[model samples]
Target: MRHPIPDYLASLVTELGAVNPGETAQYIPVLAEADPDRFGIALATPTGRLHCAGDADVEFTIQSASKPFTYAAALVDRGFAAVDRQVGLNPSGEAFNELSLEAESHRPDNAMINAGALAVHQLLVGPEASRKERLDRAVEIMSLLAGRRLSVDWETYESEMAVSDRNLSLAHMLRSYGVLQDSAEEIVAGYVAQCAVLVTVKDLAVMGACLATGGIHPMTGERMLPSIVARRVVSVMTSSGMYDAAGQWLADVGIPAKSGVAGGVLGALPGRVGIGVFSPRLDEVGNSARGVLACRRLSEDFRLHLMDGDSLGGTAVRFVEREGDRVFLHLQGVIRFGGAEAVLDALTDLRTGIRTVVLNLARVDRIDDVGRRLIAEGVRRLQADGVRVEVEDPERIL
Candidate 1:
């Protein structure tokens, strides 16, 4: 049977396409030239599948969405302690480009903002690496995360550099605070170049999936970054990624996300899925207009929120087969607390005279600690009732 998510994504594209308010970002002259009508959505899973619709293949500059990856690269290169010393782990609660730093420590509030991103950019690669080496390293890591070779848009890069006074000022302010070691011009240039890197919605989905799956490249199963680093980046994104609307975005969408001025929103639900949305028009808060709307709908429909405890629990028991006195129950999806309860209910409902029951977990992707305990308890109770309990866990997941 075909999965219904692709069709749902298609319907979402059409439905959100009708939301035609907002305007293309005009701060960067080149970004202002984006086609306001362009829009797309894509979702990626740990199994390497991509469900996409609309202009998912359309390419655009990454803009501010590059901050997370850049920060992650810094963490991987210089390690978290060094990076954290330069960039604090607090929300700025201001604009993305605001030139703000912690009063006592002189560290910018997290690496998602321009000030912190500039400091993080200066920390890319190694202390002795030149500007070109740092830029190339950033691109390499970002490309690996997306599972493709991505390049900078020279036109966008040039345009961004031409009007990068605000960023340059932020960089200079950071340097004054001793947070950045590189020249302000050089650091701002490298940061802008990283932002000018081009990506499609599909690429964004896969990139987010890299973070979602704990730094594993979803398609290749290659470890792009350490699990701790991925967790750190996602945590920062959870608290500070959406500019000033971070609290509202969390309350509504409930996903760790980063939005770009070029009209892209990237989200990763840890150990679950990565989502990407693009629409050239943007809201007053600088997030993608239709993209934000579509993300909220997707989060609600899929229950993608990290804090959501209620999920498709009863559906975990996908199938039941009966042969003579032997029975088999197939389970699928992520088995959590609710799913384990369903399994327990099924176990308790076993028919009389049932000699044996097999808990086939071949289809299950994961079982949380609580779920595992619940299932174990269910098996003990079943065996006490004189029903033989066997587990078919080929992956040793049990």
Candidate 2:
């Protein structure tokens, strides 16, 4: 029950709450009944601290927010190869409710969409257990991420099932294609049940934080999923996080995020923070209008974009005159998969600068294993050229 947040962020959140209000989703009667005036925001840091404002404690169904977690559950129960055989990594490009799959593979496209999510739900790895048991296990995994127990809204579940003919058809189609092993009834029921798991904006933020912290729950100190699985889930979310709006969401907001019709959008900034926004109003794409505005504002204010290499264009890399004694080089950036190519190019350019080299990486933000190997090879190549090389800020580089 925190009152005020960081003053600047609080102002930004308040501003956004007013800027983009729209219509609450009415497809489901339960969601339609939610207070349209309700709005909330929460942030969860890697240190396990939470900052919340507005109606942050109000519980809402996980809805599509359950898709990514269910997909992760599927990955954990069945390895990547098996899951890939059943689901693809491409965007479906159809309607969010469109029931479709990769024509050749018959796999759902990732797990952010209905077809893929149903496929993942079907892969829950229970031995023909009742729908409630399978759903309970899914809820258990979600609870671990939330750092608390989750309860399902039976009313919401029943209503969702009553009106889920499209999803039921999707499940039947997947079963026909061998992508789903269970009966259409079982898979759709399980999928709806998973979506009915309820939590507050605070819980959503922490769930995102678990993914941000590489599958380790910041509060509970439990590893919910392997880092590899976490990365895969995040990668998929990053590329296709926001349904048909995924590309625009990435280009403008530049974070891996997921939106649910229940008026919540959760963003994962790996290694930094998890953010959640809730507003009952939604846009044409089933994304919350105010929620999207809030996330964009948060990203801009905090420089949270995954693709922000530098605000001042690599100015964080410092240069010092070494009096021609050695080739001194410094590099700084948000350092991403594509950005590493720039690093390799920089090193190649430095090869002719001096016989002795000192490479400093203090301002670099992130580097994956491949980036590390590339750096090591660049250093070795420099040494092989009769240059005495020393790497500074190895901790940051790694």
Candidate 3:
């Protein structure tokens, strides 16, 4: 009766914690003092159940991890054209802080980089939205995605602002290039504050899950961001989230991922799971080296690649041969809520009036808790109609 998610995460942290070879981000005073040996990992479910191991609850500033959230908000506040006008969607393979722009258009490469991030942040404040309103919106998005209220570490913000010359220069450059509307310093200030939000590895996992579940809060059932925004953000993360090593990251891990200088990496596997990993060891491209290793291992073992060539085993719900009075409702693949809805769809349309309904879960290898609830509810609905409902679960999914 071993739990797979926690066991997997626990074993992963143990396997990777002993091997550390990267440097902690030394630019910021707060980040430079981080404990180099602390490591943690979490796998968040569609129901906000974050199974974690090691120092998953330990606090850290979410450095560049905040960029994707802000980019999504910008998309909603200002339409894609307005946002795209300010920032290009292509990857900037140069150093993350490089003060450069696209050759033809002066816009920064993508919202994941600092220049593009500043451009995106400038668009968050509309004619009706003040600085406080913009900050409030940012807080709301972060809280909704994490499934809990999160606060900015003002000390970290102050520390980051002290040594933010490069960001300040980039913000001014964006303003001069007509990509940024507001005061360059103000936009950069708010962006820095956004990056300084305090978060745990568990919190990041929930946020990634929010993206994986199509911008809906899985447990709270709140709409954090639009599905289109989530999809586009995840797409950019796949292409440009990593600094210069993004291509290598995608080639190996095959997950849409983003990393922070504070030693956190967030991975969202489109229809499956969200991974949050932390270790204060960064590689040449400002990525968590150990976190990268852990993610590659998990992606390979679980076959979580977005482009995984293997089929997902066809439609999740089916109907098999009927025997006497029993109607076999065959379920296959993963029984997620989407597939469960199809099962319920087929249940109500059962042709032979008032016959016994037997669900077959023999083909289901794994399912989430929400999927189990869905199955129970479907059976209850059948039972409410005075039909005898039986289940044949070889794997004991219930």
Candidate 4:
């Protein structure tokens, strides 16, 4: 009699824990010490409803998963034009820290990479704020998205700062290109702090839920980030968030997602669900091994793919009446671009000497811009064929 979602998650987390093909991230000493057996999964909806299983309460450093949040923060502070000028949006097929940059502008390929992430982190700092204030702003933005005040894991931060030569090199490259306005060392330090924010699977799910609902906080119903900012961040995450495995992850999992080397993966399904999974084991590309599998299974079993084409239409046509050489269609529900096309198709398949057609939308709820235009075009087509077409929309939804 209870909801099946929690039961489903309990079983999924238990079964996926059996996958043990990867090791904890070794580049960071603190991360290398993470318990590889710790596994968790959580799913949250735009309405703030959440489900969890296994070690969903276990906390871990966010690592590369912080890229999306920092990038969104940069957009919030500097706007999209400024952020785009500093960092490219195109996906880089190379490694996450391969010094990938456009040859001409020297802009990093995307904010999901280390170079781009560093540039974005620098943008979060105010020109006049102290170093502490700058770091606070970065953490504040993330906490806002997570819907809770989250603190940095100083142990992970110290461990990363000690062995950050590669990231330091990337920051220097960004500074050389003028992408970084602050000292390269300072920017790298704050960037590391951003990555060290500790979060549980539930926290990640709630953070993703904010992005899933176009920057609206699920519980508070407040705008955490601008809708445009959330859209762009999610867009970039779709293409570059998985590092070199971006295309493979998209084709297989079909989720707009970001992964961290600390064994965290977060996904946001626009207007639907936000998913988070953790297991301190990474694939060759630094994506959580079991986390990726969890997303793939969720996408498949629930038909969650953004491009899933399972709808065959028909519900929009509420009722149709046919008389000699005349037809009347009573349409209902919200009509989108695709639904408008379906309506047009059904109307044309009459295969009779239809001299007159009437589209009655008395019960229709709404019609978007493209839907309205398409319906008008369909009417024009029928009118061009010497058929009289009339739209009977009491609310003028079209």
Candidate 5:
């Protein structure tokens, strides 16, 4: 059976939901009409189980959250080599609305940002089709990611266009740079329609989980994106993940994540789970404040940080056997930050055992500098205890 969500999750959501409160998104008139206090959250594991609290079923426009998917779709529709000719991989680091381009190559950065997203929007298939048809296909692609059909809120789309002069300016700039070939209006309209694609927290969770599960929809078993394309998309998000907050988020959460102005944050943990949180309130960076808090809680409380392997203190250590005067320790799992501590604790427990020690790291995949130092210290301690130690699989540590 799947694990149940702890009560603290519900309590935390309720408490943070009220902090900073909600503010209307007036850039789009349709969004400006939404209830400011609306909040929701959903967590989906690779096993297809979902845990949710608050108004998780409430529908909302995905807004900028759609950028990553559009970028992925472009990569799949046009291979990396082709798309690379249009967009580079560096962060512009300017305001999102700035008309930025690569200094030397004149390419937009990867599609997670505005300029790149608009460039990718132009690359979507059926350039000859009417604007409506192109938009419908984009919605279709998004639906595939959600494991269900989706529709754009026409009103939202129209409102987005009514005030999309800034985006149009950026698209025109890309055209001048020869990075885009389509009419700026069509590209901006298609991009706006994509942003208007409606979804609930549950849909967002499944969509994110699809990215985590190698582009396979967890519940539907449909491959929405190729594994290679999905990996590149996730990597781009990691490098340019949270806009101005990218570095801080990587340091604290240690996961690739995307946040939208529509009050949703989606985190992709490769080979693990997808996390989604929705709260309408906005921080200065245009992120959902409560959503960030919830994700931080999930990472810390569950020991889910990708960098926590060493901090675990050798918890992966297992008993192999004792032969004559020697005690053998089998180590499994990657040795990262917190995980190395677990290894130390395990070595301490075996200090009183046989006078000889052998560490088997055959199952270990990675160990950072901190983990290596801890292992060296543990070896010295073992020697001080008159225990001769040998590593069974030193090559695996390398």
Candidate 6:
């Protein structure tokens, strides 16, 4: 049978589609000429379940949506020591194409911006490599996230190259600071070509799912990246992914998210789910306008916000049924960030005189990175606060 989620997604698109806002990005003519009407949404879970609606399968250039994945690849390939040295992880707080870098370090504020992306592109290949090799390497790792081989839309790449002055200038600035170690002209072309990699909402969902699953591809069960690397990548995306408006997005949406100038937005809510959204209409800050609206709806409907405490319901649905002094946190189905919050909610409710706190992972078979982190952190805080705790084969099932 078909899933019910696609139905809700379709309804959300219809509701949000009527109110058109924002303009198509015009830093390049091709992106500027994109149709402003297309829209889509997709959701994927670590169990490999998929749901999508509207034009979820339509392909388009990934644009800045590629930043997080590329940075993840760099971390996996070069390790944190080398990658962090090459690129700072702070938010740029400027437009996506701005000419800015860290004042003290002279590094790009983060890999999400043009300057840092070029520095990352240089890390993918040495100073001596040709254009074809750089493109090939990008495909190699990004394919892991897309769950299949991805090729550059050479036409889009060529079009973007024709208007590459801003990025080229950023590269020149990076070089003057000694952060960029290769040919500025060549690396800018490579970075632009890399950005021209094409993707769909469904592909984006799968990619975010892999990240939510801690770098393991849900379908193929292949280890695409280290768990630590995925955590680091998503951590940065949470704070710096949405360009200048990232702070506002975190305050409102409260989901770890990323956006693309070509009109794509996505979030990997730890063990919860991966959400992908697309629309060509962009707001003043270069984010997908309709996509952002849809995310707010989903966030509210599912209680998917990162800081939400009591999620789903007071039982019969989300959490474990507490009994007597033995409070069991019943983790079932797909446990994600909400699972941990629900557990915390129960703890707060029972802060009264309670006996042993129980963690029953009996019916559950999985726990995602967010679930694991929050669960452990929550358990420790309680234990340190003079409360006794118990676990029921948590690590085995989780």
Per-residue CA lDDT of candidate 3, range 78-146, in tens? 888888877887886645533455466678998898888888777785756677777767777777788
Q: Is candidate 1 or candidate 4 better by TM-score?
A: 1
Give the range where candidate 6 is weakest over 10 consecutive residues by summed lDDT. 309-318
Report the candidate with higher TM-score, 4 versus 6.
4
Query: Using Cα atoms with residue i matched to residue i, what is each candidate's TM-score against the true structure?
Result: 0.80, 0.77, 0.79, 0.79, 0.75, 0.78
Any idea what lDDT model 1 has? 0.87
| lDDT-better candidate, 5 vs 6 | 6
Alpha-carbon deviation at 293 in model 2, angstroms: 0.6
RMSD for each of the candidates: 4.9, 5.1, 7.0, 4.7, 7.7, 5.8
Clashes (backbone N, CA, C under 3 Å), per candidate, total: 0, 0, 0, 0, 19, 1
Q: What lDDT is reached at residue 250 by model 4?
A: 83
lDDT tens per residue, model 6, 135-209: 678877778778899878888889888888888888887888788777788888878878888999988889998
Q: How accurate is candidate 4 locally (lDDT)?
A: 0.83
Clash pairs for candidate 3: none
* Local accuracy of candidate 4 as per-residue lDDT tens digits, 1-398: 98799889889887887768887888876788877888889999877799999888899998888888888887877777877788898887545443455467578898888888888888775556666876888789889888889999998899889999988888887777788877888989998988999999988899999998888898887888887888998999898887667788788888899889899998898778888898889887678899888999899989778677643256778878897789988888758766788898876787643788899998786666877888889888788888888888787567
* lDDT by residue (tens digit), candidate 2, 1-398: 53455455567667776665577778778888888888888899877888877778888887898888878887887788878888788865535433444366667777888888888877776446667666877898888888888998889999888899989888888877788777899889888888888888889899999999889888866677888998998999997787667888888998899888889887898878888888878987788888888888878877888887533233434554365868677767655445556656766766354667777787775555866787778778878878888888868555
Better of 5 and 6 by TM-score: 6
For candidate 5, lDDT tens digit of each residue in 1-398? 64468355576677877665546566765666667776777877776887888878888888888888877877777788888888777754536533445466677766778888888888776346667766766787788888789988888878778888989988899888887787999899889889888888878888888888778788866667887888887887777877666778878987778877788888788757788888876766677777777788888878666566423344567555778788887877657557678878877877464878888888786566778888879988888888888887868563
Clashing pairs in 1: none
Q: How close is candidate 5 to the true structure, as a TM-score?
A: 0.75
lDDT winner: 1
Question: Candidate 2, clashing residue pairs?
Answer: none
Error of 1 at 8 (Å): 1.0
lDDT score at residue 40, model 2, on the 0-100 scale: 87
